[PDB]
Amino acid sequence: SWEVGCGAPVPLVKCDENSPYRTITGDCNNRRSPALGAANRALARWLPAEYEDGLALPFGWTQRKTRNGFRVPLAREVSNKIVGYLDEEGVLDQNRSLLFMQWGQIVDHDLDFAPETELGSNEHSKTQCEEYCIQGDNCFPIMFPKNDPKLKTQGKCMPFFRAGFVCPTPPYQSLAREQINAVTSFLDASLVYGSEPSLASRLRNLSSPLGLMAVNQEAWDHGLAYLPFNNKKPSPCEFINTTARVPCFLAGDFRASEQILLATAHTLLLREHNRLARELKKLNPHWNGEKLYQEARKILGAFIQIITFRDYLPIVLGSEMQKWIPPYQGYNNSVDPRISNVFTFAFRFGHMEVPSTVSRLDENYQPWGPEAELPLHTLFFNTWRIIKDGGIDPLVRGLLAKKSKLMNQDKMVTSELRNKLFQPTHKIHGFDLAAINLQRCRDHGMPGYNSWRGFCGLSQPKTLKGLQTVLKNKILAKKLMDLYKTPDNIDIWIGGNAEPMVERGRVGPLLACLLGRQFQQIRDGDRFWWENPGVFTEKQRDSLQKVSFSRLICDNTHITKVPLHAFQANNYPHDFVDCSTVDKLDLSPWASREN
Ligand code: HEM
Ligand SMILES: *[C@@H]1O[C@H](CO)[C@@H](O[C@@H]2O[C@H](CO)[C@@H](O)[C@H](O)[C@H]2NC(C)=O)[C@H](O)[C@H]1NC(C)=O
Ligand SMILES: *[C@@H]1O[C@H](CO)[C@@H](O)[C@H](O)[C@H]1NC(C)=O
Ligand SMILES: *[C@@H]1O[C@H](CO)[C@@H](O)[C@H](O)[C@H]1NC(C)=O
Ligand SMILES: *[C@@H]1O[C@H](CO)[C@@H](O)[C@H](O)[C@H]1NC(C)=O
Ligand SMILES: *[O-]N=O
Ligand SMILES: O=N[O-]
Ligand SMILES: [Ca+2]
């Protein structure tokens, strides 16, 4: 018995049950519950929220309020003692390319975004948080521990603002606070096309009727398209180099320019849409723009689905894949396709896969110029290195030929993210993504590690020795007990990521369970899943079965040598074959028989 429809923010229910295409918002996918999976709704709760006061205050908020009898440790202290390391030697994943990391980020961005509240809308309250390190309302600063090096150079805290939540935004909502997912839960290329109508429209080229996405008019990549710039200010991408004055890209997702390899991946995706729109016009010149946009959008969405479920998930989940994501059996309208709050933390395992450097490689997969290799932190919000320093081709080559970082219980997150992160409006390369993650799962009222172990049918260690056995690591176990004092209090992000990885995968048991279930649900509860009877023709699906990340690159760059299995660790020229030996996507089956 509780409020059973607090859905005032955004009440669109404007459904056509005939339509053969997805809405932009995700609405109308589920017929019986048309808002399921739609953007701008609460994240699903797989377990009840756990706040210090039952309703909204994070654990950690009030000094003298314990969690199960013990103070929760500072996020930055956990970062410093557990998550950090010095030596990047030996940290690379000998069987995952850098594309493996990058595809994770892409998928993540398609599925979830819980942006900071906008209550620092015309308030020095946003600057006062930064300035004076003063907790209150949505300002929840990450305070430095006593012996932190950053205390000496950066003041008392790192700023942090609580995530947006449904119902009111300035006051509270009755029942526990529920954070918003601002993008569509469906794996639907929302990161290319947008999750809101206005953005979706702004991204389109409605000046010609070719059903194209807008492209950059100020720059081109050896005649290939770039994303439009976002001509609004202040621009983080301008801030990081005011000489170059190259703004951020405008994509279907706000976060597209956070790092140069994300921007790169967005760039491939846009080009594929345009290329598909132009093929379809040839095969159907009687098709108008809307029809061309929608049909291209639908192919791209399928492409992302296939890559993710056929190529990516099996080498994340490994032995657990088959357990959580059995072969498809059609749409089930009883499944909840909403992204869970916990999943938005579980999928941050990617953070331990980001290595300290990025390379540009030439057409011989050799170093491109004299600074071919660059530190990751110089590449946050960096578009000028694309526009003015070789286009995406050198970066796409590095994605193929360089390696992801390997999760390591002793080497968890690179200092390029731990210590050198840049965030818009904060001016310095001085933040800590690990700390942010821990603060965020308190912000989101996350149950602790054992609650999730319980949920997944796994043991719940209560002692040091129990923790040691589960983590198979005495020293890590001991550091966690010293900080958290009971495994019940371990933040899920760090707890999940601390578990040794499953056979053939890159996450442990708990994360495999949380991730696997989520991915099962977004497949099974999606009316427009690519393999659902009805969505594509049988001839179309035989065509779509052939897609590969290799063909995506071949079709949309000037690269001509590629691996067959782009997520594996590949070395040139041994594991690189010519683009010609690579299957294409035959759009023959999209010819209509109208005459
Ligand atoms: C250099 C690479 C990357 C950077 C710079 C980066 C940065 C960030 C930042 C700043 C946030 C917001 C944190 C917060 O305020 O709570 C975030 C969230 C997130 N990241 Fe990463 N990240 C990277 C790679 C990845 C990868 C590889 C994955 C997954 C495979 C991933 C998954 C996520 C997810 C799920 C979130 C939560 C999104 C949401 O629901 O709000 N990221 N990341
Ligand atoms: C800001 O961007 C400018 C211009 O893109 C950078 O300058 C160029 O740097 C290259 C090497 O990458 C030199 O070969 C050129 O001579 C420079 N050209 C110009 C326009 O001066 C500059 O290094 C960047 N600064 C920072 C701090 O990132
Ligand atoms: C490398 O990775 C793939 C996918 O996990 C696997 O099939 C292959 O056998 C692996 N090679 C070795 C020897 O680890
Ligand atoms: C839209 O398409 C027309 C015709 O191809 C092209 O000339 C124009 O530059 C495009 N506009 C944008 C901003 O993408
Ligand atoms: C659909 O999902 C529900 C709940 O997840 C499950 O109980 C039911 O068996 C499924 N229905 C079909 C047709 O498989
Ligand atoms: O211009 N915004 O990322
Ligand atoms: O991924 N950027 O917040
Ligand atoms: Ca989506």
The SS3 of residue 537 is coil
Resolution limit in angstroms? 1.7
Task: Report the residue numbers after which the chain has a gap, meaning the C atom sits over 2.5 angstroms from the next written residue's N, or none.
Answer: none
Query: Which atom from ligand 4 is nearest to the alpha carbon of 213?
Result: 14
Question: Is any ligand 1 atom within 6 A of the Cβ of residue 563?
Answer: no
Other C-beta atoms lying within 10 Å of the C-beta of residue 84 = 17
Measured distance CA(496)–CA(494) in Å, rounded: 6
Report whether 414 contacts 376 (CB < 8 A): yes
- Give the ranges where 140-288 is alpha helix by DSSP (H): 149-154, 190-193, 197-202, 236-239, 260-283
Report CA dihedral (275, 280, 286, 289) to the nearest 10 degrees.
Answer: -50
Measured distance CA(397)–CA(572) in Å, rounded: 10
Other C-beta atoms lying within 10 Å of the C-beta of residue 100 = 24
- Omega before residue 573 within 30° of 0, cis: yes
Which residue do the tokens 């790092």 mark? 259
CA of 206 to the centre of ligand 4 (A): 8
Report whether 556 contacts 268 (CB < 8 A): yes
Other C-beta atoms lying within 10 Å of the C-beta of residue 330 = 10
Report CA dihedral (228, 234, 237, 239) to the nearest 10 degrees.
Answer: 150
Phi, psi (5° rounding) for residue 484? -100, -25
Query: Which atom from ligand 5 is nearest to the alpha carbon of 329?
Result: 14
Report whether 546 contacts 558 (CB < 8 A): no
Question: Is any ligand 5 atom within 6 A of the Cβ of residue 332?
Answer: yes
Give the ligand with the smallest distance to the CA of 242: 2
In whole angstroms, how far apart are CA 418 and each of 34, 86, 343, 377, 481?
40, 11, 21, 10, 22
Residue nearest to atom 3 of ligand 4 (CA): 208
Within 6 A (CB) of ligand 2 lie 241, 243-244, 384, 388-389
- How many helices (H) and strands (E) in the chain? 23, 14
Question: Is any ligand 3 atom within 6 A of the Cβ of residue 315?
Answer: yes
* Token pair of 486 as six digits: 């009971």
Mutate to test the pocket of ligand 5, among 36, 46, 332, 527 (most ligand atoms within 8 A of CB): 332
Measured distance CA(546)–CA(17) in Å, rounded: 31
Which residue do the tokens 């965030």 mark? 423
Query: Which atom from ligand 6 is nearest to the alpha carbon of 257?
Result: 3
In whole angstroms, how far apart are CA 184 and each of 103, 333, 522?
18, 17, 11
Identify the CATH number of the domain in which residue 120 sits: 1.10.640.10
Phi, psi (5° rounding) for residue 577? -120, 165
Measured distance CA(494)–CA(475) in Å, rounded: 15
Structure determination method: X-ray
The SS3 of residue 95 is strand
Strand partners, 204: 213
Closest CA to 438 of 75, 71, 148: 75
The H or E element that residue 357 is part of is: strand 357-359
Other C-beta atoms lying within 10 Å of the C-beta of residue 16 = 9
Report whether 302 contacts 582 (CB < 8 A): no
Q: Is 235 left (phi over 0), alpha (psi -120 to 50) or beta?
A: beta
Phi, psi (5° rounding) for residue 218? -95, -15
Angle at 185 between CA 179 and CA 190, to 5 degrees: 115
Which residues are within 8 A (CB) of 125 and not within 5 positions of it... i.e. 6 or more apart?
119, 137, 139
Other C-beta atoms lying within 10 Å of the C-beta of residue 128 = 15
The H or E element that residue 335 is part of is: none
Other C-beta atoms lying within 10 Å of the C-beta of residue 384 = 18
Question: Is any ligand 5 atom within 6 A of the Cβ of residue 326?
Answer: no
* Token pair of 262 as six digits: 């994300």
Closest CA to 475 of 569, 405, 408: 408
Measured distance CA(586)–CA(502) in Å, rounded: 37
CA of 70 to the centre of ligand 7 (A): 32
Domain that holds residue 539: 1-595
The SS3 of residue 451 is helix
User: Which protein residues have a CB closer than 5 Å to ligand 8 (ion)?
Assistant: 110, 184, 188, 190
Which residues are within 8 A (CB) of 44 and not within 5 positions of it... i.e. 6 or more apart?
336, 338, 339, 340, 341
* DSSP secondary structure string for all residues of 378-411: GGBT--HHHHTTT-SHHHHHHHHHSEEEPP-TTS
Other C-beta atoms lying within 10 Å of the C-beta of residue 253 = 24
CA of 126 to the centre of ligand 8 (A): 30
Closest CA to 448 of 52, 117, 42, 43: 52
Question: Is any ligand 3 atom within 6 A of the Cβ of residue 504?
Answer: yes
Residue nearest to atom 10 of ligand 1 (CA): 433
Using a 10 angstrom Cβ sphere, with 0-12 exposed, 13-18 middle and 19 or more buried, the burial of residue 229 is buried
Q: How far apart are the first and last CA of the chain?
A: 59
Which residue do the tokens 């578990």 mark? 499
Report whether 164 contacts 115 (CB < 8 A): yes
Within 6 A (CB) of ligand 7 lie 255, 258
Measured distance CA(334)–CA(31) in Å, rounded: 10
Using a 10 angstrom Cβ sphere, with 0-12 exposed, 13-18 middle and 19 or more buried, the burial of residue 50 is middle
Using a 10 angstrom Cβ sphere, with 0-12 exposed, 13-18 middle and 19 or more buried, the burial of residue 578 is exposed
- Which letter does DSSP use for residue 27 in this model? T
Indicate the length of the chain as a whole number: 595
Query: Which atom from ligand 7 is nearest to the alpha carbon of 105?
Result: 1
In whole angstroms, how far apart are CA 156 and each of 143, 252, 589, 590?
6, 36, 62, 60
The amino acid at 317: L
Report whether 284 contacts 568 (CB < 8 A): no
SS in 3 state form for 405-445? Answer: ECCCCCCCCCHHHHCCEECCCCCCEEECHHHHHHHHHHHCC
The amino acid at 217: Q
Closest CA to 531 of 193, 305, 230, 223: 305
Which residues are within 8 A (CB) of 534 and not within 5 positions of it... i.e. 6 or more apart?
none
Report CA dihedral (576, 577, 580, 582) to the nearest 10 degrees.
Answer: -80
* Token pair of 503 as six digits: 């056979």
Question: Is any ligand 5 atom within 6 A of the Cβ of residue 335?
Answer: yes
Question: Is any ligand 6 atom within 6 A of the Cβ of residue 230?
Answer: yes
CA of 363 to the centre of ligand 2 (A): 23
Angle at 300 between CA 385 and CA 282, to 5 degrees: 100
Measured distance CA(523)–CA(304) in Å, rounded: 12
The residues assigned a catalytic role are 109
- Omega before residue 509 within 30° of 0, cis: no
Question: Is any ligand 1 atom within 6 A of the Cβ of residue 120?
Answer: no
CA of 330 to the centre of ligand 5 (A): 11
CA of 259 to the centre of ligand 7 (A): 8
What is the count of structural domains for the chain? 1
The SS3 of residue 150 is helix
